[PDB]
């Protein structure tokens, strides 16, 4: 419709009428109507195909770099349509969160200024042994970036990190 | 467009209808509440999008069946739009709806080549609920509508799935 946040929605639904409701004790018009959303759910990805048919800055030359290193990222709406995990060298410069394809690049994939975001640990954002590495950088526009870090303690550390800035500082 | 808010019906009515008084789990209880309050959230964003000659109903030419419908399109009836009373006439292969059967031009018209037609006794919680039909384009957009008796819903979809079918 007008998409990002559209996308995060249908993301949300599926993650619902697949697993949430997996395993649960419903009736039989229930599961078939399940499985059915589950099916149109699935076709309706297609839709969204011909959509794919801050100045720049070295990553050092980032000053008063809070926190930085490799993460794996993924935006919300992306996913809902299947597309993999991107490892990215994170920085968070100031108040401004970097991404680049590594830490000698001279110019960022692109960036957002945290003020306003939201940040938690999900352990729902990938089906693997490496789920308990993820958390997620809520925007108010509706954005929604995905992360899995190294380890746990590293997720961890980050959401921390990105908490305290995100509200002692009012 | 009109393909996203028809799957979002579908969606809406599930997790709110579908899926009351079922026997959900805390969390599947807390999740589906929170993600009614989700699908209503988004309604917003389709807002900007509301901010064939001109014929008379009587000079309709070759008017294979015609009646009055309750007229709803699916992708509207997700942001609330409602049913409403059209006389709607075929002519030919063109679908023409109009506010009375005496107006002088059509609220609008399609014409039906390569369009589906179907029973659905799933679109009102209503004792009207056995005499729905809905007419489907290619494009994706979906008419709904509601007959004043069961035969008279199933005399359209006959009478529609015949020119449908063959002609050819």
Avoid at 30 to 35: F, L, M
């Amino acid at each position: 419709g007008s998409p990002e946040e559209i996308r995060n929605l249908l993301a949300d639904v599926e993650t619902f009428v697949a697993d949430t409701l997996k395993g649960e004790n419903l009736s039989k018009k229930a599961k078939e109507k399940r499985e059915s959303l589950i099916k149109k759910i699935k076709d309706v990805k297609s839709v969204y195909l011909q959509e794919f048919q801050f100045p720049p800055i070295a990553a050092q030359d980032l000053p008063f770099v809070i926190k930085a290193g490799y993460l794996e990222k993924r935006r919300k709406d992306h996913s809902f349509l299947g597309f993999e995990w991107q490892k990215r060298w994170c920085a968070l410069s100031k108040t401004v969160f970097y991404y680049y394809g590594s830490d000698k690049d001279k110019q960022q994939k692109g960036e957002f200024a945290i003020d306003g975001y939201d940040v938690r640990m999900n352990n729902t954002l990938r089906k693997d042994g490496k789920k308990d590495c993820c958390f997620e950088i809520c925007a108010p526009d509706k954005r929604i970036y995905q992360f899995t870090a190294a380890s746990p303690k590293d997720a961890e550390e980050w959401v921390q990190q990105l908490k305290f800035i995100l509200q002692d500082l009012g």
